[PDB]
Amino acid sequence: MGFEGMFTKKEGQWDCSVCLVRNEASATKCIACQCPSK
Amino acid sequence: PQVQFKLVLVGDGGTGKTTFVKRHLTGESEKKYVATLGVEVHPLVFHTNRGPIKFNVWDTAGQEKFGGLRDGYYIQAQCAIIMFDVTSRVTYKNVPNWHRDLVRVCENIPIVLCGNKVDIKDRKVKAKSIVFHRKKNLQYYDISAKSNYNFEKPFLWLARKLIGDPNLEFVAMPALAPPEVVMDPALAAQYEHDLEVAQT
Numbered sequence: 183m184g185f186e187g188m189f190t191k192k193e194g195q196w197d198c199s200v201c202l203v204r205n206e207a208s209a210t211k212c213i214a215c216q217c218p219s220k
Numbered sequence: 221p222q223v224q225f226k227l228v229l230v231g232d233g234g235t236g237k238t239t240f241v242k243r244h245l246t247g248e249s250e251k252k253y254v255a256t257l258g259v260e261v262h263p264l265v266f267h268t269n270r271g272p273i274k275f276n277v278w279d280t281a282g283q284e285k286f287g288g289l290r291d292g293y294y295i296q297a298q299c300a301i302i303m304f305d306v307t308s309r310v311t312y313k314n315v316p317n318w319h320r321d322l323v324r325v326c327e328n329i330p331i332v333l334c335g336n337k338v339d340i341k342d343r344k345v346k347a348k349s350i351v352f353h354r355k356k357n358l359q360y361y362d363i364s365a366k367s368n369y370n371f372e373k374p375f376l377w378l379a380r381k382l383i384g385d386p387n388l389e390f391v392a393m394p395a396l397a398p399p400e401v402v403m404d405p406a407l408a409a410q411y412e413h414d415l416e417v418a419q420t
């Protein structure tokens with residue numbers, strides 16, 4: 183068996199292209215590094 | 221599918237954090253610098269019997285002391301490695317300080333304690349003296365970054381804890397920088413036994 187989507191991205195989340203932290207849909211900038219959403 | 225975890229690598233300056241993370245060659249070639257936080261994020265892929273796992277290892281660019289890292293450093297940290305230098309007792313004295321600074325922001329995340337530079341025979345923080353805890357989310361390993369000794373051990377233990385699979389295995393070792401020093405096999409055998417009895 184694989185990882186069974188145990189840690190899959192939730193609906194609307196996006197990964198920061200600068201620091202790879204996972205952000206919520208409503209976040210316009212990364213919660214960690216503050217870089218604007220791609 | 222591939223899973224992804226943020227791993228914060230912290231510890232006193234000069235303990236070998238950068239030397240350690242840079243052993244993973246692909247993670248070095250694909251590292252990402254975060255200017256606003258003074259951090260290099262190394263995406264370390266490990267291939268398990270259940271698929272690939274990527275540890276995004278956060279390695280500071282400076283010499284910050286405990287409590288001196290920008291707040292964004294710990295944000296969304298899902299696991300951690302606290303490193304010290306077995307030839308410098310002060311770096312081990314500060315391990316509880318880093319642990320306190322980490323748990324203040326992240327609370328209950330799996331953490332591995334790593335004593336680096338065990339290739340140096342004049343070891344000041346001896347295996348017997350390692351303070352061990354009853355915590356299920358804390359584990360210790362000797363490591364020697366320059367010899368790749370036990371390089372995969374912290375990541376395998378974290379992967380098993382995060383996935384919840386004690387039988388998880390790495391089907392192949394990642395491409396690692398060639399060893400620059402030799403880890404004495406007799407010392408390795410003696411250290412490994414000393415840590416077994418101390419943990420139990």
Ligand SMILES: Nc1nc2c(ncn2[C@@H]2O[C@H](COP(=O)(O)OP(=O)(O)O)[C@@H](O)[C@H]2O)c(=O)[nH]1
Nearest residue numbers: 232233234235236237238239337339364365366
């Ligand atoms: N003998 C030995 N020396 C090491 C090892 N790791 C690091 N060193 C050295 O420790 C010094 C600081 O290394 P560095 O990676 O910059 O530590 P950092 O400040 O925690 O990132 C350097 O001179 C390293 O070459 C090791 O595993 N064995």
Ligand SMILES: [Mg+2]
Nearest residue numbers: 237238280281
């Ligand atoms: Mg460094």
Ligand SMILES: [Zn+2]
Nearest residue numbers: 198201212215
């Ligand atoms: Zn970011």
